[PDB]
Amino acid sequence: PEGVESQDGVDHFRAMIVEFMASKKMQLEFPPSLNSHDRLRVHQIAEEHGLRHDSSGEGKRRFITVSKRA
Numbered sequence: 001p002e003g004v005e006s007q008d009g010v011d012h013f014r015a016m017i018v019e020f021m022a023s024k025k026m027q028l029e030f031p032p033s034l035n036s037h038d039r040l041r042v043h044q045i046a047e048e049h050g051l052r053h054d055s056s057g058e059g060k061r062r063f064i065t066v067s068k069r070a
């Protein structure tokens with residue numbers, strides 16, 4: 001009995017992360033098009049899944065990177 005039960009059904013960013021987890025991508029660089037909510041979504045999901053999540057840059061250069069190494 002292990003996994004995620006609190007499913008969002010189908011989530012854009014959660015779909016991006018689940019692909020990322022099984023992909024060659026050691027780090028998933030998201031576009032600056034993500035707003036606070038979009039990032040919050042990613043931070044939440046990555047935190048629950050167990051991956052490293054951080055936003056780098058500034059604001060006009062602010063992007064979020066998810067890493068498989070956590």
Ligand SMILES: Nc1nc2c(ncn2[C@H]2C[C@H](O)[C@@H](COP(=O)(O)O)O2)c(=O)[nH]1
Binds near residue numbers: 037
């Ligand atoms: N759960 C969680 N949320 C985070 C973390 N860091 C930032 N957030 C949230 C706070 C903000 O509402 C949202 C996006 O804002 P930003 O900190 O600019 O990425 O992400 C974190 O480490 N864990």
